Design a protein around this ligand. Structure first.
Ligand SMILES: *Cc1cc2c(cc1C)[n+](Cc1ccc(O)cc1)c1c(=O)[nH]c(=O)nc-1n2C[C@H](O)[C@H](O)[C@H](O)COP(=O)([O-])OP(=O)(O)OC[C@H]1O[C@@H](n2cnc3c(N)ncnc32)[C@H](O)[C@@H]1O
Ligand SMILES: *Cc1cc2c(cc1C)[n+](Cc1ccc(O)cc1)c1c(=O)[nH]c(=O)nc-1n2C[C@H](O)[C@H](O)[C@H](O)COP(=O)([O-])OP(=O)(O)OC[C@H]1O[C@@H](n2cnc3c(N)ncnc32)[C@H](O)[C@@H]1O
Ligand SMILES: *Cc1cc2c(cc1C)[n+](Cc1ccc(O)cc1)c1c(=O)[nH]c(=O)nc-1n2C[C@H](O)[C@H](O)[C@H](O)COP(=O)([O-])OP(=O)(O)OC[C@H]1O[C@@H](n2cnc3c(N)ncnc32)[C@H](O)[C@@H]1O
Lengths: 555, 555, 555
């Protein structure tokens, strides 16, 4: 409790101690973990994450690190700490889950900060409404939970989730992060309606229609604002009236979110998952010119994703279990692998939704569509092996949370994922053009290119999956080089990343430099006005309170 | 030029004069119209709007009024004036079109303000890209234009708009206002990607991916930031990286928008409009419980709208041309009218989109769906008269801009529309429950209830259409009473309005009072930080720069 | 001493401790009670009140609560603490008595505050002057005391008090609260002349003529300002010269009052109390049209009060001792009760004052007046039973303090009074019109309407007496609902409450919203200027120092 390994800025030890003390004096000694010595070395697991730092560590492991961690027990709690963080100018690092792995996990941008483990005690499914087809959750509600909640309330037969590759993340955190999932409810952020947050001054706020208060009633009298129910329309319409501010709340540091309204997808009455294996590495090109109008025409239902063989392969076994060769794999061993598995070089998964008479037609147009690609082959989970990736993806394209993809995090003995994610047009050319670049460097990096193009409706997210050995300093540096390098090129070409690890937020935000950082600047102004003190997650999205030296702080 | 009828606050005449002078000294005498005497009495037309005030005037006609008007010729212009408005603390009232009729039109919230007729000279279709299925426009681009643009470039066969009941409004303004249209691209605001605005400090900003700058090239050298092209992804992905600020830009006074990226809907390959007449006033109830899961299942394509007989009737002829009776019409004369027209009490229009094999099925489920409603009857524009509303709605549900609905603005000799628009759940009950309230007051008001429920996907917008005689002070007051009254009740019931005339922004913003105006307050803080001086449209969405007395200002 | 259960805002534990320490270091350990654990559960009694909170608790019992309590021993003391409250920004909650029960008692608006038990040691009758017919008192002087003081100085034969229903309250506190009593000296606040208060800066002030200092004299040399006598005219004329500021001192948080000049009523030379029972519930109507011109003509002497049967009945026995029926009593059981007691539905008490030749005439006009009401019946305490309410009221209408009315606080097993008190015109219509509303809700509330119209000379105070069970959370919520509900309606009708419990000060102050809170705003400005720090009773009368989030604070 007395002497963490790292103080936040300008902070005195006594102050830390007092601050930390009052905090124990509220959330309970149970709710706080002070980080006193390096024996923190304990990185974690995906099963039970470390909140102190970056598990997959690229910089010094100990580089981005908490001074201590706090489990607020309830909103009022969050409110009080904000007060203290304000009294002492101790800044906070709020997190729901811990899982922002491949992005930094629980590690705070600024070291010596306070990690606000929000999900610990705030695990509630506040509500699930069928007629509205939505749910309301706390940070702590992981996807699996949100799911089991449905199962145990026999709702599955009426409403469905939308999960990301992994089952464990916070439904809530992922949404503010603007994460991605598979069904037609894939765009997480967009699926929200009505949120709540403890702004910096410690004041509570609820968005959109969340502002229009539920009328009064004998049963609702005297409940803290926090515990008050919401208005009817709160979660069925996100806008409200006048300035639509929710966005200041995603991937920013404008506030601490306590709750959120997530739309649920009504069981559609028909579902069919599949694969369309692509034979040549260059097929990736025509496939896109293909996938393009189908998605826009909505012939393409959920989010199409087109996987690189190894992703699947890695999902399948370690790199070693395929070729004990320190260098990266030859254009040739892939094909060999591509065949060993019955996959392509490129591997397109999707799903059809609803009444079969329409699923049937759609498939015709698609199946019929991808036919111009030679050696193309179509499948249904049944037409494939038991360890089959497509197997998992079927649960996936239907809200069922897996955990199997993690295994690809295993390719290299010390696995640590990291993802580069320039966004590119749905153009086979551009897709190809992008890729070339990406791969080339992975090469240069001593790296196996590994990645996928998830298809947005009018844009495409290229996720370069960089595993790397968390213990080989030589490689990690190679990775940092690679990273920052790719960032530069991408932008050189006009492609921005849309999400990133802690260590690159800056470089990333700077790419977005039109008219002289005009945007960053605007932002700063707003962060200032609202977080006069910088307590809330300074450095996020590379945004810094004036209290922070851009000089001492950026990277 | 010398002596407008109204000065903005704390402004001296000399100052006005100097301010106004320098302004002529840039935009040209052509670009400015000084409002010197009441002979402004000239209200307008929909064909060529008055910018000085509120055409359909509820308060004193002259109540909300410009001191003068200015047509910025180009962005730099807008930038300079901002400077002047800042030099003199003269505030501005930016408008694209002029058409915000039923909301106030060109009338500025604060009188003596400067009306910034943005659309006058900034009429450009900057771009339309087919592969992206989007366009980029200036305030001045009205819908008809955006349309004729397609026609004259033979694009109609590939891309389609999404219009509101009327053809003339600014595509751009309507979007920031969060307006509504008919096709599946009905949600205007949501269809935007990449915008540009002159913030208050006069600095330019482009959102999302608009921040990621187009790489350099010999042909783009030396163009003002304003004239620079955009990045590839600029208009195909709205988010960018870090804080998603676009929303601060809709229905707010955070900035002056110069341009915007609007998604275009690719010609779908099949379209079928229709009507399903509802016989009993109470049918409105079951219809909704009906429409509800179809929209969520997406069986329901574009935005369903369920019209009250009179809307159609009024679209059809004046109230007099149906019953010279100063009082409002009897539950009975309607039915009589409902029959005279072949319509119902309630009248549901929609459209099917794409390949007939799917249109066909959909219609079955729908046609098949509404069958539980007795006396229900289905139609295609062909199955109806030539003056038929459905005729117009077919052009409408397909991006073709009409002008015919205006005629309903004619019901009462001096027609002036005004709309009340509580938002309610897609629940027949609630729908009914809402309505009751609404109508009851229209009664009390000496008013014909006239309205419609446009169906949002998970919420429903009830548009009460209040015509009223712009010259009968007795009635107008009745209307104000009605208004403010309805506002109170609605909220009493938990329904917020989402858009409103100038004269009620306040009352409206106040309904949104959860946790003590927590939201309004937050907003104010942001407006402050960014418009330290209050020049930009103070009072909008009922948000006021501290420079403004809430005491002297609210209503 | 070390760890109260609640800190005031932004306060650190060490600070509390230091603050609390210095305070012990002056007023004595005897004078302070630190609130360390929930074992505070001890609500109290009317005989010896709890200062920590709200005895009759509507919100969480523990909702509004002290951090500790302090008994300043003398003014200098009050002055020093003010200093400390200022040094630490610890705010204060000053109280004389503790009895503000049905309003909150000793509970501070803001929890974690310091309760300033002023009356503990400042119990003095500083003076009673016969020729002036006034007295001067400290907070601690309860009414009984002020009375016994007269008895033991044989003054009763020359001067008389004016008590409220209860004997125990602070004569002083009740006056600043603008309380009410029975004789012609019923308007407490108005009976004051010359007061003294420790303003926020810790500086002492004496009002009106209190400012004109008593000339110097050998015997008065060197006495603290506090102990200095007053000028002659100090207590016989309230105004002084220039701005009449006393009012900033009643029901506000502009200062801590240490003393006050209260006018005494000279024994009048004749007194006769009585009752005029009203038979029908609707008699209440004509009675008022009756009582109206008599009061204005002054035929009506003291404050007439017209009681609802149950008040008397409850004064008489518990509800159970009349009808074991969880629901509220039938219009019928009342009449039955009304008869069981010899009372009416409505029950008008009063008194005649002075020389019999005039009392005699008055009574004629009155007796003669109420004769138009059928079944009307007149009485003198003698014409009634021993447990008779009128018995008590005779002592009452003559300054003699009872304690018997408390028993009505007993109707329901866990008794807790609360009072709603819209003010209405002296119009039988309005009176009736008001009542209807009030009762209707009590209904809805599962509540027995219980109340009375005390007649002001040109306005009438309707005191709805809500008992309710302090342990039944279901009911309490019902009460809050009821409350806030009634508040809304009343105002809907144009009736304001004039006094209220802690938990509604806000809702109440907001009703008073003419011209946009113009008044509240003005007030705030003044509180600001004078209590730059907010230490003095923030939130009172719903007025909050800018140091206080209206967002975090209101209700
Ligand atoms: C390891 C991994 C990650 C991954 C994968 C697959 C694997 C094997 N899939 C594949 C993928 C990856 C990236 C992209 O772009 C697409 C696909 C994912 C997937 O399919 N879709 C995704 O969107 N992400 C995937 N990820 C990444 C990762 O698994 C997810 O992003 C997790 O959901 C993140 O973890 P979680 O524990 O939910 O978040 P947490 O550690 O709590 O941090 C959230 C961040 O947001 C802010 N924040 C969080 N909570 C709050 C609160 N309460 N208030 C305010 N802000 C909050 C913080 O800044 C925090 O840093
Ligand atoms: C008369 C009428 C109106 C109408 C109708 C039908 C009729 C007969 N239909 C039916 C309807 C009405 C309301 C609702 O809610 C639904 C349906 C409409 C329709 O089908 N859908 C609509 O969304 N609106 C309809 N309306 C209302 C009206 O016709 C439209 O809202 C117009 O599009 C508004 O006029 P326009 O000329 O485009 O706007 P303008 O006068 O320029 O003002 C825009 C406001 O927004 C801000 N703003 C505008 N330009 C800028 C710029 N450049 N920068 C910054 N802010 C800007 C301003 O605050 C301005 O006040
Ligand atoms: C329980 C009850 C209450 C009651 C009753 C009858 C019963 C059974 N009678 C009937 C009645 C009730 C309400 C109304 O409107 C009319 C009639 C009362 C009566 O006949 N007349 C009344 O005026 N009130 C009656 N009340 C209510 C209650 O009994 C009285 O209001 C008491 O006199 C209040 O208690 P007391 O102990 O005197 O006050 P205290 O707890 O010290 O608080 C006073 C408040 O004023 C401010 N304040 C107090 N002291 C100071 C000092 N020294 N400086 C500055 N401000 C001070 C504080 O804000 C404090 O909260």
């Amino acid at each position: 409790e007395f002497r963490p390994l790292t103080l936040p800025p300008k902070l005195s030890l006594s102050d830390f101690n007092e601050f930390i003390q009052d905090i124990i004096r509220i959330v309970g000694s149970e709710n706080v973990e002070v980080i006193s010595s390096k024996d923190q070395i304990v990185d974690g697991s995906y099963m039970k994450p470390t909140h102190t730092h970056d598990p997959h560590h690229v910089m010094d492991q100990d580089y981005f690190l908490a001074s201590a961690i706090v489990a607020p027990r309830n909103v009022a709690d969050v409110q009080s700490i904000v007060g203290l963080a304000n009294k002492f100018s101790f800044p906070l690092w709020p997190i729901s889950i811990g899982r922002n792995s491949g992005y930094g996990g629980a590690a705070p941008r600024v070291s010596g900060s306070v990690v606000l483990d929000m999900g610990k005690n705030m695990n509630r499914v506040l509500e699930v409404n069928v007629e509205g087809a939505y749910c309301v959750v706390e940070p702590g509600v992981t996807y699996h939970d949100l799911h089991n909640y449905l199962e145990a309330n026999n709702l599955r037969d009426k409403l469905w989730l939308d999960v990301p590759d992994l089952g464990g993340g916070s439904v809530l955190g992922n949404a503010v992060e603007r994460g991605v999932g598979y069904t037609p409810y894939g765009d997480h952020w967009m699926m929200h309606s009505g949120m709540e947050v403890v702004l910096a001054n410690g004041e509570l706020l609820r968005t959109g229609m969340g502002a229009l208060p539920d009328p009064k009633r004998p049963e609702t009298m005297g409940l803290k604002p926090e515990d008050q129910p919401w208005s009817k329309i709160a979660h069925l319409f996100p806008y409200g009236f006048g300035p639509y501010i929710d966005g200041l709340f995603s991937q920013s540091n404008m506030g601490i979110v306590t709750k959120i309204g997530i739309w649920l997808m009504p069981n559609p009455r028909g579902y069919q998952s599949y694969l369309i294996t692509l034979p040549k590495d260059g097929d990736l090109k025509q496939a896109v010119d293909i996938i393009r109008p189908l998605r826009l025409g909505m012939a393409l239902q959920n989010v199409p994703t087109i996987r690189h063989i190894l992703l699947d392969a890695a999902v399948l076994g370690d790199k070693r279990s395929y070729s004990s060769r320190t260098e990266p794999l030859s254009d040739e061993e892939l094909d060999k692998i591509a065949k060993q598995l019955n996959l392509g070089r490129w591997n397109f998964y999707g799903a059809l939704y609803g009444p079969e008479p329409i699923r049937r037609v759609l498939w015709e147009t698609i199946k019929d569509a991808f036919s111009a690609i030679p050696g193309v082959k179509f499948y249904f989970p049944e037409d494939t092996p038991e360890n089959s990736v497509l197997r998992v993806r079927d649960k996936t394209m239907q809200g069922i949370p897996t955990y199997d993809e993690l295994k690809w995090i295993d390719w290299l003995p010390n696995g640590a994922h990291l993802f580069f994610s320039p966004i590119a047009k749905v153009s086979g050319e551009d897709a190809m053009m992008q890729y070339a670049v990406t791969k080339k460097r992975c090469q240069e990096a001593g790296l196996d290119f590994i990645g996928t193009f998830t298809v947005g409706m009018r844009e495409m997210h290229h996720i370069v999956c960089i595993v790397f050995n968390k213990k080989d300093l030589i490689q990690k540096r190679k990775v940092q080089w690679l990273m920052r390098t790719l960032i530069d090129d991408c932008a050189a070409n006009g492609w921005g990343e849309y999400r990133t690890h802690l260590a690159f937020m800056d470089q990333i935000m700077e790419t977005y430099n039109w008219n002289n950082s005009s945007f960053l600047r605007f932002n700063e102004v707003l962060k200032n006005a609202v977080d006069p003190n910088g307590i809330i997650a300074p450095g996020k999205s590379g945004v810094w309170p004036s209290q922070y030296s851009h000089v001492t702080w950026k990277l």
